[PDB]
Amino acid sequence: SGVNQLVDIYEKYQDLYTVEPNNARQLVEIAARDIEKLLSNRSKALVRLALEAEKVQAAHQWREDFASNEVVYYNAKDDLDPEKNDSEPGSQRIKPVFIEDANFGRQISYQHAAVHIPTDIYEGSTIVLNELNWTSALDEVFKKNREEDPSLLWQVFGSATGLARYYPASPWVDNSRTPNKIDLYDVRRRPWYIQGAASPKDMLILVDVSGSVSGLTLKLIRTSVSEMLETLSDDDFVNVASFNSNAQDVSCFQHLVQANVRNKKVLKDAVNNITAKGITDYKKGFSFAFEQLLNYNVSRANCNKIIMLFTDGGEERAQEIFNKYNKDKKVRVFTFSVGQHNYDRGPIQWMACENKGYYYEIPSIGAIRINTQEYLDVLGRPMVLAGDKAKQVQWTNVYLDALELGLVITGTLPVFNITGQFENKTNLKNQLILGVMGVDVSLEDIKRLTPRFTLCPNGYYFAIDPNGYVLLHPNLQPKPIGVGIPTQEPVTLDFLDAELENDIKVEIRNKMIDGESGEKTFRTLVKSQDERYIDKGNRTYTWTPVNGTDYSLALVLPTYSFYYIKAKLEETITQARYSETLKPDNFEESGYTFIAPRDYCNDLKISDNNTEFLLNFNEFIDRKTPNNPSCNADLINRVLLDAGFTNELVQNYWSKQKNIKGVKARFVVTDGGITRVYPKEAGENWQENPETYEDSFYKRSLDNDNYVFTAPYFNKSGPGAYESGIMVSKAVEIYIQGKLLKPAVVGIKIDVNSWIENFTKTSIRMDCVILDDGGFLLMANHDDYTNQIGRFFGEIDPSLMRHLVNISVYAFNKSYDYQSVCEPGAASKQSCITEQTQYFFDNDSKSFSGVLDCGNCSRIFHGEKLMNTNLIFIMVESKGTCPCDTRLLIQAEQTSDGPNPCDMVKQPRYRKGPDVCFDNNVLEDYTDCG
């Protein structure tokens, strides 16, 4: 491999670079200031938009005749064909000119805003036409916002009438006019709209499962309760109770639990499993509901206490229960008369009036979606009357954009009805919000405020919610959160679920939620990127609060990553000489070169096809001198310096030898971006990530100060192991001015045959297995195990694997992956939680011998750990004895339901709720029961 040769190369050129410090405190403070600057820019855009929306709606005169004055708008769900006949009677439809923009990745028109109207909502109605008229001012303010900040993503006006007017005119996603693609999108059900349209809730959904709801009414009630839960965010707490002559909880929850995805699925399953039987008692159900809303022993959103009565009808107004429990009327009661029936709805409508609530009817599936949006419409009354204190910008949980942009957050701001203000008029429905303004922030807009390329591959940033969900994390993927076993939701991954959970990490998580700033160096169990290995890492977490927001940014930084190599390439011809070693023509003098697809130049487009990107990079390097402000100087300088360093190893130490019997490929990978592998025949078999910071072996080999044997993948059809080799890697540990830097990882793809020979050559001076960390078979001598090279040991011989775990030569950590796509079982591929385990050297001892007491027999083994490497030799001598192969140790991504949420709501993770919330105002007009 040439560890010492590349080390000597690095200290021999200390004049070509300057070792700079990675001051974690300064990095976190700077990145948190950048994040708060971005979020405050978006907040300013939101304030502009909401101010203009209120100003322009307040100056809008109603009409019922838009034929004499058409409204001209672009319907997002309109075909691109020039159809002049596709105009509604009351509206003229725009046909836009669509450019393709890289920031959005779709067809985008910056001239005007697009409008989404739900299919269930007719676009020619008076309500919709008036909205489409007064929102053109929003259109030009959209244009102003985008011209003051060209990095702006979607800025949208979610209207309370159903319309969404978002600025960059783009056609709706796939459901404009398409069979099997129906548009069920409604802006008033979006998490940002729901978040900005009211304060966090405390529901108790009371379900009336009595005899009278059997059949259709029960079906409608359970679908309605599911769609009601689908409007609850993570700041809302919910329980579902059912009553028939006595009330009970539908699920394992005995108190208001947080309305996150897993708890909501528990409640949805409990509702779906519910049955209709018995007589009704509205007093014993409301007693239960009010008692559960008074349970302050548990985590709650101490705000907006609600009861959602999902009944059909009855002749019981239940006066005295309401008088006893709701006398000052701290709890709203929303009553739903679900089903197609003729029962008395009078008491149901009265419960809403006497309890500040609202009455809704759901006669069929199809009315379900709208009435829930409407309780939200009611809940915003105290928020409107608290005029300008309520207009605070909130940031939604991370979710997947409807018009696909990946993971985004979005800042919300309610828009209020201001027709009579300082000229006080009747102001009938001025207690309702006009809508919610939104502005999207991409997680990749935040990822470029946290640059990771002066950091080690093991170092990274991550932000956190007050619920603990990560705004930013290397392990947060653009996939919906798995919620259980398979048979429009936020991607809310907790911090303790994105990583491996210690107790130090729980204390750090709580400190980050609390908004404190601190540092903590400790020993971690760093799970490897391939998710098969675990390292006893050595990390330093430094966190700060992102001011002006409820976020908290931290930086994970290894103890060897406090210094980095800032390339001192300014001779303009030395970097050129390093450049010619990159061109895809010298891949026999120098090794098969891969460049890491980073953002070196603004005009480089990164590609997965690495040779295409290498060609583009070489083209850009050819003519570089005039491109001073287009190319990132530091990244290109570092990659050129490291290209020179690896050339002076592939030539001066490999090309002078050119062949070794045991090896099959010699590779060097640098944190600059170069991953040269010598022969170029085994360079085709090289299937590691071109980006060096995403290489599992690289990050694995920086933690270990040993030689790391990366066992290959078993039963994976590709380059394989026999014709590619089995990887060995060590990280160079150069010292510059007494500073430990580990800038590269040299390695060897040891040939399997050249090693099996040397494994069995000295037998003259059969069962003998070589195992690495994680218990993966590097090979055996039995020549039948070597067929299964790179396979987990427990799959092969479970008894010895389980025993070796029992002696604790191998500990393990079983964790849950919440974002894994999944083959759906029976009661394409869906998303489940997988339950993944990783083994590792538990103890520091070297020799492990004992007797394997297999059933009615006995086996003897001896384990010895090879020094300066992650391997163990297991000298187990027992084959074909009595079978204790009763089961297997399948180390893989076992599909499973996650942690039992019934048990982890009794001891829930620490969580901080929103500070200011608006409920129970006295200027409120409760006389609109509907």
Partner 1 sequence: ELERDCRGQYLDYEKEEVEAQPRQWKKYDFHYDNVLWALLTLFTVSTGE
Partner 2 sequence: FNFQDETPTTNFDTFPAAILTVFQILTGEDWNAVMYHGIESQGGVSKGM
Ligand X SMILES: *[C@@H]1O[C@H](CO)[C@@H](O[C@@H]2O[C@H](CO)[C@@H](O)[C@H](O[C@@H]3O[C@H](CO)[C@@H](O)[C@H](O)[C@@H]3O)[C@H]2NC(C)=O)[C@H](O)[C@H]1NC(C)=O
Ligand Y SMILES: *[C@@H]1O[C@H](CO)[C@@H](O)[C@H](O)[C@H]1NC(C)=O
Ligand Z SMILES: *[C@@H]1O[C@H](CO)[C@@H](O[C@@H]2O[C@H](CO)[C@@H](O[C@@H]3O[C@H](CO)[C@@H](O)[C@H](O)[C@@H]3O)[C@H](O)[C@H]2NC(C)=O)[C@H](O)[C@H]1NC(C)=O
Binding residues for a divalent metal cation: 208, 210, 212
SS3 764: helix
Q: Report in angstroms how near the CB of residue 214 gets to partner 2 at its nearest.
A: 5
| 8 Å CB contact between 177 and 184 | no
**Residue 468 backbone zone (phi > 0: left; psi -120 to 50: alpha; other: beta):** left
Residue 521's binding partner, choosing from ligand X, ligand Y, ligand Z, none, with beta-carbon cut-off 5 to 8 A by kind? ligand Y
Q: Report in angstroms how near the CB of residue 249 gets to partner 2 at its nearest.
A: 25
Helix axes 261-272, 216-229, angle to 10 degrees: 180
Phi and psi at 784, nearest 5°, equal -100, -30
Q: Report in angstroms how near the CB of residue 864 gets to ligand X at its nearest.
A: 17
Phi and psi at 172, nearest 5°, equal -60, 160
- Distance (Å, rounded) from C-alpha 654 to C-alpha 660? 10
Find the binder of partner 2 among 216, 386, 854, 892 (CB under 8 A).
216
CA 112 to chain CA centroid, Å, is: 32
Amino acid at 484: G
Using CB under 8 A as the binding rule, the residues of this chain from 338 to 357 that contact partner 2 are 340-341
CA 191 to chain CA centroid, Å, is: 15
Residue 123's binding partner, choosing from Ca ion, partner 1, ligand Z, none, with beta-carbon cut-off 5 to 8 A by kind? partner 1
Find the binder of partner 2 among 195, 210, 217, 355 (CB under 8 A).
217
CA 467 to chain CA centroid, Å, is: 14
Phi and psi at 219, nearest 5°, equal -60, -45
**Per rule CB under 6 A, is residue 37 in the interface with ligand Y?**
yes
Q: Report in angstroms how near the CB of residue 637 gets to partner 1 at its nearest.
A: 57
**Per rule CB under 8 A, is residue 111 in the interface with partner 2?**
no
Find the binder of ligand Y among 111, 214, 246, 547 (CB under 6 A).
547
**Per rule CB under 6 A, is residue 287 in the interface with ligand Y?**
no
Per-residue string for binding with partner 1, 361-400, x by CB under 8 A? Answer: ---xxx----------------------------------
Find the binder of partner 2 among 20, 99, 119, 215 (CB under 8 A).
215
Find the binder of Ca ion among 1, 159, 280, 637 (CB under 5 A).
280
Using CB under 6 A as the binding rule, the residues of this chain from 428 to 447 that contact ligand Z are 428-430, 434
Rg of the chain's alpha carbons, rounded to an integer?
Answer: 32
Find the binder of ligand X among 662, 718, 825, 855 (CB under 6 A).
662
- Distance (Å, rounded) from C-alpha 171 to C-alpha 177? 11
Residue 692's binding partner, choosing from ligand X, partner 2, Ca ion, none, with beta-carbon cut-off 5 to 8 A by kind? none
Handedness of CA 294, 298, 301, 307 (dihedral sign): negative
Nearest C-alpha neighbor of 733 from the set 718, 720, 744: 744
Per-residue string for binding with Ca ion, 177-216, x by CB under 5 A? Answer: ---------------------------------x-x----
Nearest C-alpha neighbor of 384 from the set 820, 928, 822: 928
**Per rule CB under 8 A, is residue 246 in the interface with partner 2?**
no
Count of residues touching Ca ion (by CB under 5 A): 3
**Per rule CB under 6 A, is residue 136 in the interface with ligand Z?**
no
Q: Which is nearer to ligand Z, 57 or 724 (CB)?
A: 57
The Cβ of residue 353 has, within 10 Å, a number of other Cβ atoms equal to 17
Using CB under 6 A as the binding rule, the residues of this chain from 48 to 77 that contact ligand Z are 62, 64
Handedness of CA 56, 59, 65, 69 (dihedral sign): negative
Q: Report in angstroms how near the CB of residue 90 gets to ligand Z at its nearest.
A: 16
CA 394 to chain CA centroid, Å, is: 19
Stretch that binds ligand Y, among 25-33, 649-657, 763-771, 790-798 (CB under 6 A): 25-33
Residues annotated in the binding site, as ranges? 208, 210, 212
69 CB-near residues (< 8 Å, 6+ apart): 63
Torsion of CA 845, 698, 816, 838, to 10 degrees: -30
Residue 758's binding partner, choosing from partner 2, ligand X, ligand Z, none, with beta-carbon cut-off 5 to 8 A by kind? ligand X
Phi and psi at 634, nearest 5°, equal -65, -45
Nearest C-alpha neighbor of 459 from the set 578, 395, 568, 542: 542
Stretch that binds ligand Z, among 241-249, 419-427, 469-477, 821-829 (CB under 6 A): 419-427
Using CB under 6 A as the binding rule, the residues of this chain from 745 to 784 that contact ligand X are 750, 754-755, 758
Q: Report in angstroms how near the CB of residue 117 gets to partner 1 at its nearest.
A: 9
Residue 121's binding partner, choosing from partner 1, ligand Y, Ca ion, none, with beta-carbon cut-off 5 to 8 A by kind? partner 1
772 CB-near residues (< 8 Å, 6+ apart): 709, 711, 778, 870, 871, 872
Find the binder of ligand Z among 217, 280, 337, 417 (CB under 6 A).
417
Q: Which is nearer to ligand Y, 119 or 521 (CB)?
A: 521
SS (H, E, C) 47-68: HHHHHHHHHHHHCCCCCCCCCC
Q: Which is nearer to partner 1, 118 or 545 (CB)?
A: 118
**Per rule CB under 8 A, is residue 122 in the interface with partner 1?**
yes
CA 96 to chain CA centroid, Å, is: 34
The Cβ of residue 880 has, within 10 Å, a number of other Cβ atoms equal to 6
Q: Which residues pair with 437 in a beta bridge?
A: 157, 413
Per-residue string for binding with ligand Z, 367-406, x by CB under 6 A? Answer: ----------------------------------------
Six token digits for residue 153 = 């993503």
Q: Which residues pair with 566 in a beta bridge?
A: 18
Q: Which residues pair with 336 in a beta bridge?
A: 310, 360
CA angle 523, 528, 531 (to 5 degrees): 130
Stretch that binds ligand Y, among 307-315, 471-479, 518-526, 809-817 (CB under 6 A): 518-526
Six token digits for residue 420 = 């009579």
Per-residue string for binding with ligand Y, 145-184, x by CB under 6 A? Answer: ---xx-----------------------------------
The residues of the shown chain that bind partner 2, judged by CB under 8 A, are: 214-217, 219, 340-341
The residues of the shown chain that bind ligand Z, judged by CB under 6 A, are: 62, 64, 417, 419-420, 427-430, 434, 525, 811, 813
The residues of the shown chain that bind ligand X, judged by CB under 6 A, are: 661-662, 750, 754-755, 758
The residues of the shown chain that bind partner 1, judged by CB under 8 A, are: 119-125, 182, 184, 364-366
The residues of the shown chain that bind ligand Y, judged by CB under 6 A, are: 29, 32-34, 37-38, 41, 56, 69, 133-134, 136-137, 148-149, 273, 295, 297, 521-523, 538, 544, 547, 559, 609, 611-612, 615, 806, 808
